Amino acid sequence: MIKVEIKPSQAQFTTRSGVSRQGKPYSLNEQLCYVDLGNEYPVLVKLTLDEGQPAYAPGLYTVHLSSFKVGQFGSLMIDRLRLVPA
Amino acid sequence: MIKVEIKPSQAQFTTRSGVSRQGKPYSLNEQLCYVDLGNEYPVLVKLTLDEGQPAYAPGLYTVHLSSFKVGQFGSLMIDRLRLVPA
């Protein structure tokens, strides 16, 4: 299990916006977190939230299986990092 | 934890080869496996092995932390799926 932490300073999201190729509006909500990759300190990672989801509250989390998909070359990839409480 | 299984029929690797942009030879060893992504059946996934590593033997495995890296846009990505015995 991957340990992910939302620090107190990371409790909000920001929103970026634009227009798709054929005219549709979009909005993306982004939140920061720390992921422990086994180095001397955790590293900073950007999360893009799913539609209608609030920012994750401060605390400890692990990664949900729905984060993964098989990519177009047949290898496993991360689609979007989706979290669940630890 | 991600459940990965090497079936008896997947106990070997194949090798692809070529030459890099500035003349260096390379060889890549590839092995297949099944990864349970929570659908009705596990899905087929291609693994690229690291230099000097044998094919994983048949059995159950989970994913090592070294599989992950922060990508050039700041989000988490899979570098290469690296496995450890379950």
UniProtKB/Swiss-Prot annotation, chains A, B:
Which Gene3D superfamilies does UniProt cross-reference here?
Nucleic acid-binding proteins (2.40.50.140)
- Fetch the InterPro entries from UniProt: NA-bd_OB-fold (IPR012340), Phage_M13_G5P_DNA-bd (IPR003512)
- Its signal peptide is none
Q: Where is this site: Involved in DNA binding?
A: R16, R21, Y26, Y34, K46
Which one of the record's GO molecular function terms can you name? single-stranded DNA binding
Q: Which GO terms describe its biological process?
A: DNA replication; rolling circle single-stranded viral DNA replication
- Alphabetical UniProt keywords: DNA replication, DNA-binding
List the residue(s) that the UniProt entry marks as the site Involved in DNA binding, and in the dimer-dimer interactions of the protein-ssDNA complex.
Y41
Q: Which domain of life is it from?
A: Viruses
**Family in the record:** Belongs to the inovirus G5P protein family.
Its job: Binds to DNA in a highly cooperative manner without pronounced sequence specificity. During synthesis of the single-stranded (progeny) viral DNA, prevents the conversion into the double-stranded replicative form. G5P is displaced by the capsid protein G8P during phage assembly on the inner bacterial membrane.
Subunit organization:
Homodimer.
Q: What is this protein called?
A: DNA-Binding protein G5P
Q: Which organism is it from?
A: Enterobacteria phage f1 (Bacteriophage f1)
Its gene name is V
